[PDB]
Write a protein that binds this ligand. Structure first.
Ligand SMILES: *[C@@H]1O[C@H](CO)[C@@H](O[C@@H]2O[C@H](CO)[C@@H](O)[C@H](O)[C@H]2NC(C)=O)[C@H](O)[C@H]1NC(C)=O
Ligand SMILES: [Ca+2]
Ligand SMILES: [Cl-]
Ligand SMILES: [Cl-]
Ligand SMILES: [Zn+2]
Length: 206
């Protein structure tokens, strides 16, 4: 056999003010939640041969630094414009906002398609919708997938996980049991993405 070259996603994760309020204004426990969610994101992405490197953690304890509203899309781009300033001081590949608020329209997470590594769109927003950390992580990993140009899984894609096991990450539907692996279809799409020049910033080992 042969060894595949690993990829690394330098991740910066942010907890908005509402999530902080939800965690009873406990800074330590809010940070712990972000770390646990990142941990599950790492587990999921590893099935794509991508390892997570947590660049930074940030909790908006007194005020949101970017406007977070019921509008997932508005919230996303407001966060992405804020991410630019942050990137200059603390470089990272992708910034992810975890919010305690719910979005209008049944939306649970959102990110720009194929924006991985781009200064203007390499990030995403996810709601911490489940008591379980893996819930938000699955949502965040799904959006990172979209960021990497991955589409939702077609008809018979995802054989490496059944219903009770949570299925695959790029499934069109979300809910418990949550997914822990990306389908083979997703893995092929990712290798094509890299080969074609996408996600150039995931090459350096932190
Ligand atoms: C999500 O929100 C952004 C920002 O409001 C939308 O982007 C704007 O799109 C319009 C029309 O395409 C342009 O005139 C603006 O210049 C864009 N603003 C930018 C680039 O920041 C985007 O279309 C929205 N996505 C939706 C609702 O699907
Ligand atoms: Ca990098
Ligand atoms: Cl290839
Ligand atoms: Cl080629
Ligand atoms: Zn999707």
């Amino acid at each position: 056999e042969a060894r595949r070259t690993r990829k690394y996603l330098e991740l910066y994760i942010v907890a908005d003010h509402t999530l902080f309020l939800t965690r009873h204004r406990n800074l330590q426990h809010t940070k712990q939640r972000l770390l646990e969610v990142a941990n599950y994101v790492d587990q999921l992405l590893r099935t794509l041969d991508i390892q997570v490197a947590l660049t930074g953690l940030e909790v908006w304890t007194e005020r949101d630094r970017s406007r977070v509203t019921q509008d997932a899309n508005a919230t996303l781009w407001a966060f992405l414009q804020w991410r630019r300033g942050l990137w200059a001081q603390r470089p990272h590949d992708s910034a992810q906002l975890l919010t305690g608020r719910a979005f209008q329209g049944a939306t649970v997470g959102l990110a720009p398609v194929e924006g991985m590594c781009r200064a203007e769109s390499s990030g995403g927003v996810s709601t911490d919708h489940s008591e379980l950390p893996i819930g938000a992580a699955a949502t965040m990993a799904h959006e990172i997938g979209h960021s990497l140009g991955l589409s939702h899984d077609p008809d018979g894609c995802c054989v490496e996980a059944a219903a009770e096991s949570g299925g695959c990450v790029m499934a069109a539907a979300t809910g418990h049991p949550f997914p822990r692996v990306f389908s083979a279809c997703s893995r092929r799409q990712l290798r094509a993405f890299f080969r074609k020049g996408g996600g150039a910033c995931l090459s350096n080992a932190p």
